[PDB]
Amino acid sequence: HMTEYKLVVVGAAGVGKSALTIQLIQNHFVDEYDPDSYRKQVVIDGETCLLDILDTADQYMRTGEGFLCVFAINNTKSFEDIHHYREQIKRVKDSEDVPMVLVGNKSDLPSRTVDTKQAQDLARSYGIPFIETSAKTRQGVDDAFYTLVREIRKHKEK
Ligand SMILES: Nc1nc2c(ncn2[C@@H]2O[C@H](COP(=O)(O)OP(=O)(O)OP(O)(O)=S)[C@@H](O)[C@H]2O)c(=O)[nH]1
Ligand SMILES: [Mg+2]
């Protein structure tokens, strides 16, 4: 009675992968978590979905159905590292069409070193959606995860 979607959250250290996941799971913002798998049942477009979410630093990398590729909008390096995460995902999947969303987190912070245009340009080159989030305020969090689910459906029957 529920459709399972296996999601994997990747990106450089400190960008907010756990905070985003915890927002989705607990509806709470964690300032300090310890640098595993989570399950969430949610109805997306009339379908009861069981999300299976791996918050990374492989099994889930080979078996993940879709990826959130997260950088922080005040961490230029994390943005630059997206290329390396995306290449990695493509290698395993032997495909240039893997369900993925580009997420620019920490939108509440004033210190923005990656502009929205840089991010939009990158997502456009990859053929994927770009969503801005804050795990702190919860702006964009559901959007990012729901959009990923929709991208998985777009690529394959579920
Ligand atoms: N202001 C603000 N801080 C955030 C946001 N998301 C995460 N943080 C903070 O950034 C720090 C890193 O977040 P965290 O979720 O631990 O990163 P991560 O990508 O999971 O890091 P890793 O080391 O486990 S591989 C934490 O102190 C967390 O509170 C956000 O949207 N806004
Ligand atoms: Mg973490």
Q: What percent of residues adopt helix (DSSP H or I)?
A: 25-40%
Architecture (CATH level 2) name = 3-Layer(aba) Sandwich
**CATH topology-level name:** Rossmann fold
The distinct bound ligands, ions and cofactors come out as: 5'-guanosine-diphosphate-monothiophosphate, magnesium ion
CATH superfamily: P-loop containing nucleotide triphosphate hydrolases
CATH class: Alpha Beta
Biggest β-sheet strands, sense, barrel: 6 strands, mixed
Return the domain count.
1
Which structural class do you get from the secondary structure elements? Answer: alpha/beta
What are the salient characteristics of this protein?
6 helices; 158 residues; six-stranded mixed beta sheet; alpha/beta; monomeric; hydrolase; Rossmann fold; GTPase KRas; binds magnesium ion; Oncogenic mutant
